[PDB]
Amino acid sequence: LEQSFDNSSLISSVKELLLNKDLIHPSILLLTSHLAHYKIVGSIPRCIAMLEVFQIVIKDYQTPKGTTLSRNLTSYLSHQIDLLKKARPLSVTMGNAIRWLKQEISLIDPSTPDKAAKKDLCEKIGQFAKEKIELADQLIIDNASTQIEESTTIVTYGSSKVLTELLLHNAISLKKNIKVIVVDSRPLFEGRKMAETLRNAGVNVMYALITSLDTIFNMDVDYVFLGAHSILSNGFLYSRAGTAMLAMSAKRRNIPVLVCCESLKFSQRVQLDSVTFNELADPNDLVNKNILDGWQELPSLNIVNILYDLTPPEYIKKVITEFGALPPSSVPVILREYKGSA
């Protein structure tokens, strides 16, 4: 009660809707079903999957009689976003795409016979993720590869989002020697997906848990690379929980730390505290007859499960985007030069 972070109302556990005024897309319920019951995403996997259902749901237009297609879809698509907000609040990978999409709703005129409404939207929103994601990730590949020598180590955290493809390129598409250290944490064992993949790729993978983190650093170790969820306007890395403890330690143990990221994952907002702006996710998950049951109904017990947390930018040495590399204090200068400009 003294910190009262349990009464930080960033999320509730509300469910069970029945309303049928909107024609709810059945497949967008599947997307929310695939998130909230068991999380299967990073952030750019959402930015793919949020786009996967959007190409389908615009194809079923269902434009009514006395309404322009500019007038209904700004309500029709945005009503379906609140289904996701019941499941999981948005990211900036969510956020920067959808406001760009709401521009495209507004910049059309009453001239389209709804047959032309596909290809002016379809390839355009396809060339979004073709440019802003795919070949944006291509420029990640050449930039990080020249900053990695052979016969070294990489320490990652959680499931990566883009540097999985980077580790595939340096182990197979360039065949230089490399050892991989993947560490994830209870409850979301998403780093095991990388641990399956890179040894299916056939490379030296050492799996790890965050409680045993010191003895990884007591060996020959360097080049700590990180996934990301958003970068603050200061330089704080808003990312998956438990990122900063290796980010403080490897910076304390004088070997450099980088964050693989992109310009789409920037943001205008700013903060400097970990427990201010976050999300909780269903406190039943940290249980597994069990050992304990009854965080409810029992006096003086609670289960927290932090999803996102900030890292100080002094821990990060170099921030790499698709345009290049940059020091972490110099993050917000792209916000005036490329994001909404490029």
């Binding site: 972070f5 409850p187 970990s274 427990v275 003086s300 017990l301 289960i303 932090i306």
Partner: peptide
Amino acid sequence: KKLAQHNIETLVVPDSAVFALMSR
């Protein structure tokens, strides 16, 4: 749980979250 019997406002954190509440 035994401290919940003696009810000292307790709550369980995961291992990854312990940096994010260390400022408090």
